[PDB]
Design a protein around this motif. Sequence first.
Motif, PDB file in Angstrom:
ATOM      1  N   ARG D   4       0.850  -1.181   0.000  1.00  0.00           N
ATOM      2  CA  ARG D   4       0.000   0.000   0.000  1.00  0.00           C
ATOM      3  C   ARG D   4       0.889   1.235   0.000  1.00  0.00           C
ATOM      4  N   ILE D   5       0.693   2.094  -0.994  1.00  0.00           N
ATOM      5  CA  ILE D   5       1.477   3.305  -1.188  1.00  0.00           C
ATOM      6  C   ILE D   5       0.598   4.509  -0.880  1.00  0.00           C
ATOM      7  N   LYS D   6       1.111   5.406  -0.041  1.00  0.00           N
ATOM      8  CA  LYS D   6       0.460   6.667   0.287  1.00  0.00           C
ATOM      9  C   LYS D   6       1.278   7.815  -0.284  1.00  0.00           C
ATOM     10  N   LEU D   7       0.591   8.761  -0.924  1.00  0.00           N
ATOM     11  CA  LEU D   7       1.217   9.909  -1.569  1.00  0.00           C
ATOM     12  C   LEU D   7       0.572  11.189  -1.068  1.00  0.00           C
ATOM     13  N   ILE D  25       3.450   0.755 -15.221  1.00  0.00           N
ATOM     14  CA  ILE D  25       4.392  -0.324 -14.934  1.00  0.00           C
ATOM     15  C   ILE D  25       3.651  -1.562 -14.459  1.00  0.00           C
ATOM     16  N   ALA D  26       2.532  -1.383 -13.759  1.00  0.00           N
ATOM     17  CA  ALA D  26       1.757  -2.531 -13.309  1.00  0.00           C
ATOM     18  C   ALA D  26       0.900  -3.113 -14.421  1.00  0.00           C
ATOM     19  N   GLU D  27       0.496  -2.292 -15.389  1.00  0.00           N
ATOM     20  CA  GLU D  27      -0.318  -2.801 -16.485  1.00  0.00           C
ATOM     21  C   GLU D  27       0.525  -3.578 -17.486  1.00  0.00           C
ATOM     22  N   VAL D  67      -3.281  20.503   0.762  1.00  0.00           N
ATOM     23  CA  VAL D  67      -2.440  19.326   0.605  1.00  0.00           C
ATOM     24  C   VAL D  67      -3.314  18.183   0.116  1.00  0.00           C
ATOM     25  N   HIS D  68      -2.973  17.634  -1.046  1.00  0.00           N
ATOM     26  CA  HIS D  68      -3.743  16.591  -1.699  1.00  0.00           C
ATOM     27  C   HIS D  68      -3.094  15.237  -1.446  1.00  0.00           C
ATOM     28  N   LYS D  69      -3.934  14.224  -1.237  1.00  0.00           N
ATOM     29  CA  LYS D  69      -3.495  12.894  -0.834  1.00  0.00           C
ATOM     30  C   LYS D  69      -4.050  11.847  -1.787  1.00  0.00           C
ATOM     31  N   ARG D  70      -3.300  10.760  -1.959  1.00  0.00           N
ATOM     32  CA  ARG D  70      -3.694   9.636  -2.794  1.00  0.00           C
ATOM     33  C   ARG D  70      -3.241   8.336  -2.143  1.00  0.00           C
ATOM     34  N   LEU D  71      -3.951   7.261  -2.474  1.00  0.00           N
ATOM     35  CA  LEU D  71      -3.695   5.946  -1.910  1.00  0.00           C
ATOM     36  C   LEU D  71      -3.765   4.897  -3.011  1.00  0.00           C
ATOM     37  N   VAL D  72      -2.937   3.860  -2.882  1.00  0.00           N
ATOM     38  CA  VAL D  72      -2.867   2.803  -3.885  1.00  0.00           C
ATOM     39  C   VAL D  72      -2.501   1.491  -3.203  1.00  0.00           C
ATOM     40  N   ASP D  73      -2.996   0.381  -3.756  1.00  0.00           N
ATOM     41  CA  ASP D  73      -2.546  -0.957  -3.387  1.00  0.00           C
ATOM     42  C   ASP D  73      -2.180  -1.709  -4.657  1.00  0.00           C
ATOM     43  N   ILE D  74      -1.042  -2.408  -4.631  1.00  0.00           N
ATOM     44  CA  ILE D  74      -0.396  -2.861  -5.858  1.00  0.00           C
ATOM     45  C   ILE D  74      -0.200  -4.369  -5.927  1.00  0.00           C
ATOM     46  N   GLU D  75      -0.394  -5.101  -4.836  1.00  0.00           N
ATOM     47  CA  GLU D  75      -0.360  -6.558  -4.770  1.00  0.00           C
ATOM     48  C   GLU D  75       1.058  -7.125  -4.694  1.00  0.00           C
ATOM     49  N   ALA D  76       2.103  -6.307  -4.792  1.00  0.00           N
ATOM     50  CA  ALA D  76       3.465  -6.702  -4.427  1.00  0.00           C
ATOM     51  C   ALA D  76       3.828  -8.076  -4.996  1.00  0.00           C
ATOM     52  N   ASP D  77       3.896  -8.132  -6.322  1.00  0.00           N
ATOM     53  CA  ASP D  77       4.272  -9.361  -7.008  1.00  0.00           C
ATOM     54  C   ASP D  77       5.790  -9.531  -6.951  1.00  0.00           C
ATOM     55  N   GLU D  78       6.315 -10.465  -7.746  1.00  0.00           N
ATOM     56  CA  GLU D  78       7.737 -10.791  -7.688  1.00  0.00           C
ATOM     57  C   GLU D  78       8.597  -9.581  -8.036  1.00  0.00           C
ATOM     58  N   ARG D  79       8.491  -9.101  -9.273  1.00  0.00           N
ATOM     59  CA  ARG D  79       9.310  -7.996  -9.751  1.00  0.00           C
ATOM     60  C   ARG D  79       8.635  -6.643  -9.603  1.00  0.00           C
ATOM     61  N   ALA D  80       7.335  -6.614  -9.306  1.00  0.00           N
ATOM     62  CA  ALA D  80       6.630  -5.342  -9.211  1.00  0.00           C
ATOM     63  C   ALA D  80       7.258  -4.436  -8.166  1.00  0.00           C
ATOM     64  N   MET D  81       7.569  -4.980  -6.989  1.00  0.00           N
ATOM     65  CA  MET D  81       8.131  -4.160  -5.922  1.00  0.00           C
ATOM     66  C   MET D  81       9.470  -3.564  -6.336  1.00  0.00           C
TER      67      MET D  81
END
Lengths: 54, 64, 195, 100
Positions: D4-7, D25-27, D67-81
């Motif tokens: 989970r990435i917070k920006l 990059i994830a697509e 201040v603007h905020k964003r959130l993401v979850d990416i599933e942390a695969d093998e090479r994704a991280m």
Amino acid sequence: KADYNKRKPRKFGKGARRCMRCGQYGPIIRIHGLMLCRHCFREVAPKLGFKKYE
Amino acid sequence: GNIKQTFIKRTARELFDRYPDKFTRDFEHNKKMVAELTNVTSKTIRNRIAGYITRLVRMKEEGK
Amino acid sequence: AIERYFIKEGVKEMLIDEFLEKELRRAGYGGLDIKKTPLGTKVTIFAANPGYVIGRGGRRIRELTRILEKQFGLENPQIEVEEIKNPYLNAKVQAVRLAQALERGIHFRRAAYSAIRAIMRNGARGVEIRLSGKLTGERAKSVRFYQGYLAKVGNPAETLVSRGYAQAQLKLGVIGVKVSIMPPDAKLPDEIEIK
Amino acid sequence: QKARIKLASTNIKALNEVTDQIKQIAERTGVRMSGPIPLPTKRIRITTRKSPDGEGSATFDRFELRVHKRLVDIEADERAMRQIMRIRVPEDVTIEIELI
RNA sequence: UCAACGCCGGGAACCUCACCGGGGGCGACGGCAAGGCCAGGCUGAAGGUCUUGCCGGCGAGAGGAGGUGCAUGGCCGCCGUCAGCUCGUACCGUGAGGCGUCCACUUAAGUGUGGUAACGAGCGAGACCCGCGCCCCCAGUUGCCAGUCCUCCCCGCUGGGGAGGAGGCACUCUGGGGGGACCGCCGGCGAUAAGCCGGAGGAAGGAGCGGGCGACGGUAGGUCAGUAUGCCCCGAAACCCCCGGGCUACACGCGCGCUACAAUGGGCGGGACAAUGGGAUCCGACCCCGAAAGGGGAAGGGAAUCCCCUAAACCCGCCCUCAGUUCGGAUCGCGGGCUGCAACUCGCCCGCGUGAAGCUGGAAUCCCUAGUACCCGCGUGUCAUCAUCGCGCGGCGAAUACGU
Ligand SMILES: [Zn+2]
């Protein structure tokens, strides 16, 4: 002789805080960690990133 | 006041004195034409220009 | 939290900017940029004459990066010294130049017209200069020179025009210099062009 | 496993940059993503008095920092991280990542 | 005077501090040891000072909450968010100066259309920026839960009603982009123009609503006690520290407000419904002591996750029934506690008693045009504690005029 020249420490009151830029005592902004007086903030605010927006 | 400004009127008079074969007596058609022919980042100004052109043509069909 | 970090960054970099503003006057000080990294903190200084900052026989570049450690506590940093090309469009350097002239002894009208034409010959749609103080005898007064276009009030005043202010300390007192410049690539909302 | 990435940032363009970069990059690789998710905007307001003295009517100065905020979850695969940590992020954006 | 008087963000216990009483320290650099400590006495206390010993090897300036805001800068207030101020060339005039910038209609507007010894530009206005309200697309957690499935619980007249959990984003909401309203269509008036007025259509109409930015200059307007700054002045003090007092002193005159002088109400008991914002030795749920103020443990939280937070006016039922009272609630006494190095001078809170003026207010005078005013309470700023104040938030919600 070096003792009778410099302050008692203050952990609270009014002489505990002091402006970072000029050195004033009384009026000080403390909102969200700032430590500027009401005078220096109005001058250095557009540098910190504040806008009118109103 | 519902006043049109001089630079608006100037732009519209120019766009109507050249490129006249495009505009008609309807509003949205001329909105499209104006946004096609100009470099603009607003909408109120474009609508003002389009309505002024509408007026111009709807009484140019009559002359004076 | 979040706001605390942002605001502390702002305050620290602003205090550094002011210290440098006052202790690098001659060289010309146009700005600053601090970049955070794990390799250490980089600090880039803009200016016109980097040689003054460099201090050929040292005694300056180490003064600088050791005071940054002693007082403002930057993480084992080091500094780059860039240079401004076409500095005749930044107003702070021009204001400090004019003030240095006034301190040398030039007549204010002479120097003002010199600066105005030098800013015209290099690209500028408008410029405005203002002086205030004991220019002619005791009774203070304010004087104003201008050329071209300007955008005093609105949003473009903020976002297009470059402003600068400085002080000149003379045998008698203080003189205030204000400069405002409109770059060439400035376009207003009313300046349309037909295709 | 998921990550989970917070920006957070004062600029929307940097946020959009980072979002587009990690989304692409994830697509291009096979990984189910999440977001982008907008959280409410944090506004720091400060109303002060203009005059440095007392005399004169009271005219107040209202400054604001959004201040603007964003959130993401990416599933942390093998090479994704390892391919996401290799991003070129501007220094006006605060990015953090947490493994769940 | 408007434009001083809950203003200097000025709610001062020490500090703040600039005032009063007393004590003690400070001489860069340049020219003919300095400094430190046990035990005790002077002392409000003190290697400050001496008793007793031992360790160590004249000129300039720093600084100044000291004068000058009538020496300056910069910042603010007022004429004024008013519609005004100038330029180039030409022309009229000996000249100062005029014209343009005037007249008619129009506009919030030196905003615009027509005529003219003027033709043309600029800076202000408008444009620009922010937010509220309706529609569409993407998105779907830390936000939401209708329909779906499993469980569990309770109730009558057997049909209805709630909590988990999986699992979903439909509705709500959040925040990015985009559309939509322009006098555009429809009959007058004016001039056949500029625009105004009906009427239509339309979530919304006539710069849609609320704000920000505020010109060339004036005001010897306020600020040297926010920083910066020239001249004089103190330089061994007017510099720099501590320890106690004062700014809280009170025969009176004024400004702004709070609380009331009753029933368009006081009290007791029960029923309800928010929003804005803030949180590290900080917010503190939950449990336990204490009648209350308050005390001891302590989950969670670094902010769509947890807390501060079941707001008050309002509705229902009983007592009071036009009275200095079951109105009013000042002033005093005994007691119990918190914050703090220190609460007498001079702090906030609680419990029981006491119970002062006040029965609607002369002459005069202030604020307000719609989710506005009146009325009700709530975060935040100051803050170790202390809000009858400032800046904002919502709840209930009108009256009159569309003018001079
Ligand atoms: Zn300051």
